Amino acid sequence: AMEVDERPNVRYEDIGGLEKQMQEIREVVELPLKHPELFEKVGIEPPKGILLYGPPGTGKTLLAKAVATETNATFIRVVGSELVKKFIGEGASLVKDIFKLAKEKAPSIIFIDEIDAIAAKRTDALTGGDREVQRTLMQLLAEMDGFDARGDVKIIGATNRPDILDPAILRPGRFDRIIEVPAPDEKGRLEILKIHTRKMNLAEDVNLEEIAKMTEGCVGAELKAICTEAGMNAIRELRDYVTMDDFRKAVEKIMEKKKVK
Ligand SMILES: Nc1ncnc2c1ncn2[C@@H]1O[C@H](COP(=O)(O)OP(=O)(O)O)[C@@H](O)[C@H]1O
């Protein structure tokens, strides 16, 4: 299955701590989408597909939505694993309907979450089981090498497991840009903290700088959760405003939850 969102609502001012990878996408998919005739006359060939790596909850989906919003393209999220049907032609079939729908509601960004589900290189020619998943993988590449000219429909792939990937896919004329989207540094965390606390009622004791410092290697999704946990501590103590203290308890909770070793 695929989840469709015609006009997503994600703006770049809301994606923290990815200044460079944000710019790279902007110019490597947004710009081509906006100005195909320009890319044409200037000379350079834009990517048909771009691939995003790194941990889960880092903002990969986010960026894609963000591009989809800045371009009023139909956002199309494809759940990688959900394409692993164990029946003849069933996987490939869904890929077809997905491109059918991407063109029908073009412009559109197809963001495929976890393509390593489909595009993992197996182990060898004792394929059996994942011979069918190969039938699907081939279907995708067909659609790609296929319809694609410049930019009316763009494809973004995402994985947190890039060396499992099949070189076949990384070939030019497919996913040839591969951007890392990493857990953010300290500087990064703070921006993300500023974004998610932007609509909440913070007490004047709340040193955000401090909490960014407290959250070694959390991801944007985990930080988002911290903000909504801190608020709930306030609610729990029937308040109206969120305290430096609340956050220390949120951080503390989420960091242990993270230590699932
Ligand atoms: N860099 C970030 N900036 C702002 N919000 C983020 C960031 N990373 C994660 N989030 C929050 O967590 C959610 C999950 O991000 P998403 O892009 O879906 O994760 P993934 O990188 O796995 O695609 C986002 O909707 C956003 O609210």
Side-chain angles (χ1 to χ4, degrees), residues 14-16 18 55-62 111 192 195-196 220-221 224:
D14 296 331
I15 308 182
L18 291 172
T58 321
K60 286 174 258 50
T61 310
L62 256 201
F111 167 87
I192 316 186
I195 278 141
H196 288 112
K224 210 233 145 155

Side-chain angles (χ1 to χ4, degrees), residues 205-224:
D205 46 58
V206 177
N207 172 359
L208 289 180
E209 275 85 335
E210 168 69 291
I211 283 150
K213 196 129 197 137
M214 287 165 67
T215 37
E216 300 272 1
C218 294
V219 287
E222 271 167 274
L223 300 175
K224 210 233 145 155

